[PDB]
Design a protein around this ligand. Structure first.
Ligand SMILES: Nc1ncnc2c1ncn2[C@@H]1O[C@H](COP(=O)(O)OP(=O)(O)OP(=O)(O)O)[C@@H](O)[C@H]1O
Ligand SMILES: Nc1ncnc2c1ncn2[C@@H]1O[C@H](COP(=O)(O)OP(=O)(O)OP(=O)(O)O)[C@@H](O)[C@H]1O
Ligand SMILES: Nc1ncnc2c1ncn2[C@@H]1O[C@H](COP(=O)(O)OP(=O)(O)OP(=O)(O)O)[C@@H](O)[C@H]1O
Ligand SMILES: Nc1ncnc2c1ncn2[C@@H]1O[C@H](COP(=O)(O)OP(=O)(O)OP(=O)(O)O)[C@@H](O)[C@H]1O
Ligand SMILES: [Mg+2]
Ligand SMILES: [Mg+2]
Ligand SMILES: [Mg+2]
Ligand SMILES: [Mg+2]
Lengths: 473, 473, 473, 473
């Protein structure tokens, strides 16, 4: 049971319009919207969306496995060994938000301060004392972006596992010699950095020149969650405000995906005429190039929606019915919708490119979709006994000799393994991950899906407790 | 009663060595060490210090007023009008951590997200609706470091007030025309940006080429807090670990100041022989050039302590008794003391250049000295009734029509004015400042003075509660 | 009769081995090697080559016209108007080395100092006084590389004409409004800068992703000069020194082209066994990425010559028979051949990327191939009467009222038109072009083809007269 | 007899106004203006000047020796050894335009292509074969500006000799160990790069914070050439055009120097009323910051000529009588004088900062003053027999075994030594220097002094022969 099984299960249910039914459906943790900073929904005047993994939630593990298979086949195509074709995607290994150390070829799970929580070389999990040889302070410099790459997105899940697969394969294949910073093959030396770049280039290629999009759109039921409540919720948003789309994807792909998402024999509610997906948006913008979008952006272009090509030249005209934009900047949206930043609730899945950047650069209000939360919540509530025991051990030790520390490490591991080999997205034991810290800092609201907004009235006041400093308590 | 009066009051008392006396003296909020993240003191192997406003705490408002007077006289010297000499430093106006907007000439107090809490043009405090003309989203882009300058340090307090003085003077002087981005004087236009640069250059000049240091060292009793407990605490640190000094100041000034700080007719305790200040340090490093120090740093030099000049060449030798270093990098300290980052507790007063940077770049443990906390604590506990009323108003409104909002704004202002015209260092009403957020994020421990460590045993476990995400609660 | 007709005519003749026959064949200006700086051939130990337009001389105007047609069809493919398909390449318009001014959409012919010699907007040649509106000092800043693009190569000849075609088309097409910096089409504004970028991108695309290479290799007789003297001369070079190839092209294309160039029923001389083209080289390097090659270069790779793919990893081994390199740097060649810069004569056609950069960065000796010289020489000797008259007019005026200036401008134009609409590669009248100045400064030797070296003994001392300053004469 | 003795000798003579007297005085090579590119003086509408070493020609070797002594005393002041005080400036060693290699501590004389002509380590002149260890291709990369510093100016002559003095001193002083890249002194290593930086910093300090200016202005007869013909020539220029001053020096120094230069008991001619120096200029601009001046420049300021301080603010007004500008850009001059680049003859002594940059960035006409030419001409004409013999040897060898090469090297050295230990500014034997090449390329006119313009009518056509390519001859 993957997180997308949970979402597609909730998606299959009819949308009860009764006001008591929505407020009661809101009880389950799975249907809740979580609040890091208070937000008065009545002040929101524009609802903004990205598409991928927000409106178009790709089914797991089928879509990761497709991306993994095409990336492997691209690497074999450029000259990697045929043994790569015997890899098979394993959804139990990767957790999102890991850091690949391109110097030593390690996947690292770190906290907000660069402290090491988990270190794996290939499929070998390196224990505390052994990591100190490569990480003397059990710490990485996050600003060393040439060395460390943060695997922020769900699109990065196939390459997260692929990187570990490759390190494992070259380590144990007799043809190659293992060195500290790569692998030697006779007169050829492949550094982990160059291998990582090949992987990155191949993932990009699969998405932009390969067949991933084509294979997705030829079997949309297999790869994309479809929910009749999505048109309903978007129609409610457009009744109280303006609605816009700003996606990094191109128009031809967006049109195919969005058409599928809205292909029901009715409009927002059963019995209503079907409307085209574009009619749900006051402003549609593709090729957004986020996060650069939230700074200078790019030249504003207009899409010829008949051919799917860009019209030649910079678009200098006004917002018109049926126009589709390409490129531009976040200021394009604000000017054309007559919005200020805090009037906008932007719903995205990219913690860095959508949420952090719109918050810091423009002061937009933010809603982070976290697809895996649909299943991490289930693990969290089911295995809560282990966390409560861990909390007790931390408290008992905080007042105590060392037989407790071995029990702390033991329960930490058992808790983490319920999530997978790389543990929870949000923590390792009692230590929070970098990802959790960035969710708390930059996502005003968050949920497994933005559809959970259906269960709250549009006057709702999302409330978070005020923060106090230690000396103020 | 300034914050330095509080510190000098506590400094004048004898250090009772009784173990029950120290743990009981620790009760008062003023003698406490506050904890943002848990820290086991037994793991600390090196105690590091800066000098200015940490070991050498400059008396307020005398030192700010001296800096203000010399900066004004430098500006008049380069051609600013004689009316500047009628300014007089006013300690009730500036709060530390304000942002000067060089485009519009405003002092801004902002939260961690760039939201405006206070805006003053000269001495005119701009009310909410009027700020929207210049700040349409009541928000500044903090990454626009060419436009916004954060006045982080206590050394910036004179220029904080001076900037407001200058804007006020040119606005109301009939010879000048007020424009949006500066002042016009016939065929001369002085932008707020160029005026700000003149101020910055003059403050730098006063510290590095003018007479500020000379005037300080010729009346040390007037300008520098002296505490007999400082040699005592440093001697205890050197009994359990190593102690180092890394100051941005030069050796000749450091030697004069430190000699004064240790000039008592005894050593650590009354009855003991006096020891030179240098004997309290395993490593002394001047001209540190923090924060660059925590990256590549500069070439490591050796001070000729007889002449006070640098020896010619890069120092390639080892740590030796009596050597004094200049420049280098944080790695110099780690290598020479055989320390890893988390072995080091670095005690500093510069939230950015000492604390944020050593934490993020090197994973050092951090102790932030906040001199004004000695008096902000007194205001906080005395006027606690206003904050509790403010908390009630926020709760009552969070469940309610708009007669409460005017009461919220009214109590916010009355609370803030107890701290001064620019309010608390840490908040405006219920909203925390950028400075408060950076203290919580990067200072593991903090206190009005590091001397408060005297009241804790060196095995102490400083404890902070574990953080949970909203969905984990 | 194009310049490549001249070369292919000389190519069709048998190579007479008689030593008196070669030294006599050297009399014609067309078979000479011209000398800017003295060069003793006996000191040359390595002969280096690029491939395109040096070993593989593409026939004119067929190859330019092919490149023009595919670039036009790529622009139409991305959305440019169908009228582009009615353009047809005209070899009489473009001269190499022109500067496209992306601000005003002009093709400029300039001297070494940025002075304007010719200015054309579309097909309209702007006369002296009219250029002063856009060029007040009849001068461009050559360091403004964001505004001015120098069309250095023969590959740039199709886009030189295409840029003029496009400016002409949009100017005179009623659907578009002509503005100073581009063309307006309703709500779309296309700047000359964005149009220029589209052209550049399309030319790149045609060469790297389109069908230009495929169409060339499917009709090599139509597109590539073939000379039996090329294997002969290369074999003589390998008898006295080492021979290397460093091409920006990839191995699969290089192999196809070079195989064709060496496909004769014999080896160097008639009657000898045929040898593969690779056997003529001590070192073969593709994907050179010149001019970056002459600085840090790129990682050194090894080509799998069976598949045409790069082997995975950096090549760390030695120079071996049959190895083919990819990337690397000029230091790769020097180290592997045991050469110093002045031991190397590098034969190239790119005045900037081959000749200027190897000379300035590495002190290599240089031989510039200038394909058009084969025909510019014929025009120069035939129409010499006009130049001599021009020289007389300059002398007579230099001692004289203004009826001479109109005659000077008149003869200048008549002389220039013999070369084409944009005049000689090397001058406009008595003023030398930027290109001529860079040939003189950075090409030690030059010729229409490097095959002219066949007519000189390998002990030859190429001689240039010593330069004196004015005060030394 | 120094070059400034020649200039001061010519300066002491009365200015005969007879038109035949001026055209006859023009015969001597010493009074001629030399021409690299033709220039019609009637087209010049503005005459521009720098001050230092153009209007204010500092006497040699007294001024170099003063600069040397103060720089040495500054280095001793910061901690260099006392033995430096026994150095004494030697005008026979330095030639202008040498390159200090900061890696190996060598002074290099190079040609325009980076080829080594002379190499000296300290006072040891390294012979051809021995230089190949450090310079394998007898070549330096001029674009490696972090390694190589070109000593372009007459102000650099003291540090040219000082650098050789220091290398010589540390090499032969027993306390220091000689390494390839510097000197070791126990645990201190001083690289040639850091030593070079100390020298550079000290020269800057002497000019901007030390006593060099003060000592110059207290003995102007000792240090500055004074010529009654200078006011005369400037008055003739102002009769036919506009005259401007753009100096890097500050106003207080400029005023002192210019007052001295114009302090005669008469105006332009004997018998005329004296006029203040400022009245000879249509535009006076100080603090020019050339060469940045010829790009974006700096903010335009106005000097308060009463106090010598800058007025506060950017000057936005027009050109007015008596105004003195500070900063700005070359566009300031063009706009205020209504000039285009080719209307301007700019007379400067800095081959890079005045001449190269105004020519390339702005297309100004250029006149380079070369003070040493006053004496290099005398050596050139006196020792012409050696050069003619050298030319014969080159011709005889160019048609010849190796007994001639030793004679070529022998005569080259004897010729060079007549100029000094580092040879002619313009050549070593038959090889031209980088400096000579840049004079020819960027100086339209040149002379030992701009005063030589007095001997030419303002309608004069300076003529240079047209350049032909080898294939055009
Ligand atoms: N999740 C992320 N993915 C990719 N890049 C990131 C992410 N978070 C931060 N960055 C960028 O990586 C660089 C290094 O980050 P840095 O060490 O400055 O931490 P930071 O982003 O300031 O986080 P914090 O303020 O919590 O320390 C920064 O320029 C930042 O913008
Ligand atoms: N207190 C400070 N004083 C001066 N500069 C600062 C301070 N805090 C951050 N900076 C620097 O200012 C620049 C702009 O900061 P930015 O907008 O990235 O916020 P940040 O430092 O990442 O804070 P946060 O992560 O809390 O948003 C950054 O490069 C940062 O290093
Ligand atoms: N033929 C060329 N094609 C492309 N770029 C060039 C060419 N010649 C020079 N450049 C580059 O263009 C930039 C601007 O050149 P710049 O104005 O400095 O002239 P330059 O190359 O120094 O020529 P010169 O020394 O003759 O003035 C330089 O960085 C230079 O390397
Ligand atoms: N006389 C000089 N003094 C200082 N810098 C110079 C001088 N001449 C050139 N430079 C600068 O030094 C850098 C390196 O020069 P580079 O190797 O490009 O030669 P260049 O100036 O283009 O000369 P050329 O065109 O004759 O080769 C350039 O950016 C150039 O502007
Ligand atoms: Mg998305
Ligand atoms: Mg400090
Ligand atoms: Mg080529
Ligand atoms: Mg000068």
């Amino acid at each position: 049971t993957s997180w997308s099984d949970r979402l597609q299960n909730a998606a299959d249910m009819p949308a009860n319009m009764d006001k008591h039914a929505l407020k009661k459906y809101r009880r389950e943790a799975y249907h809740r919207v979580f609040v890091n900073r208070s937000l008065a929904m009545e002040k929101i005047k524009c609802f903004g969306f990205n598409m991928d993994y927000t409106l178009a939630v790709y089914k797991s593990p089928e879509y990761e496995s497709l991306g993994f298979e095409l990336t492997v086949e691209r690497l074999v195509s450029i000259g990697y060994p045929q043994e790569l074709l015997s890899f098979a995607y394993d959804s139990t290994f990767p957790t999102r938000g890991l850091v690949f150390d391109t110097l030593y070829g390690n996947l690292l799970k770190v906290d907000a301060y660069g402290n090491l929580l988990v270190c794996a070389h290939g499929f070998n999990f390196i224990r505390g004392p052994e990591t100190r040889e490569q990480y003397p302070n059990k710490f990485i410099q996050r600003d060393d972006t040439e060395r460390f790459y943060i695997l922020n997105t769900l699109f990065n899940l196939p390459e997260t596992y692929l990187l570990a697969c490759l390190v494992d394969f070259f380590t144990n294949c007799p043809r190659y010699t293992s060195c500290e910073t790569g692998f030697k093959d006779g007169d050829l030396f492949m550094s982990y950095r160059s291998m990582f770049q090949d992987v990155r280039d191949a993932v990009d290629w699969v998405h932009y020149k390969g067949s991933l999009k084509e294979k997705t759109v030829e079997n949309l039921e297999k790869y994309v969650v479809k929910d009749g409540k999505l048109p309903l919720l978007l129609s409610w948003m457009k009744e109280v405000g303006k609605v816009f789309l700003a996606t990094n994807s191109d128009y031809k792909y967006t049109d195919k995906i969005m058409t599928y998402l809205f292909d029901f024999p009715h409009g927002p509610k059963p019995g209503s005429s079907h409307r085209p997906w574009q009619s749900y948006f006051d402003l549609i913008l593709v090729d957004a190039r986020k996060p650069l979008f939230f700074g200078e952006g790019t030249v504003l272009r207009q899409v010829d929606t008949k051919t799917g090509k860009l019209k030649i030249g910079t678009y200098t005209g006004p917002l018109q019915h049926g126009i589709v934009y390409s490129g531009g900047s976040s200021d394009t949206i604000c000017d054309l919708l007559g919005a200020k930043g805090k009037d906008i609730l932007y719903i995205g899945d990219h913690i860095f490119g959508d949420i952090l950047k719109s918050k810091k650069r423009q002061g937009w209000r933010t809603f982070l979709v976290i697809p895996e939360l649909a299943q991490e919540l289930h693990v969290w509530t089911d295995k809560s006994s282990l966390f409560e025991e861990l909390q007790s051990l931390d408290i008992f030790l905080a007042e105590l000799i060392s037989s407790i520390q071995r029990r702390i490490k033991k329960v930490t591991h058992d808790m983490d393994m319920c999530y997978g080999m790389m543990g929870s997205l949000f923590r390792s034991g009692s230590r929070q991950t970098l990802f959790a810290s960035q969710v708390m800092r930059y996502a005003d609201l968050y949920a497994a899906s933005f559809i959970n907004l259906l269960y709250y009235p549009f006057s709702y006041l999302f409330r978070a407790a005020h923060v106090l400093m230690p000396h103020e308590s």
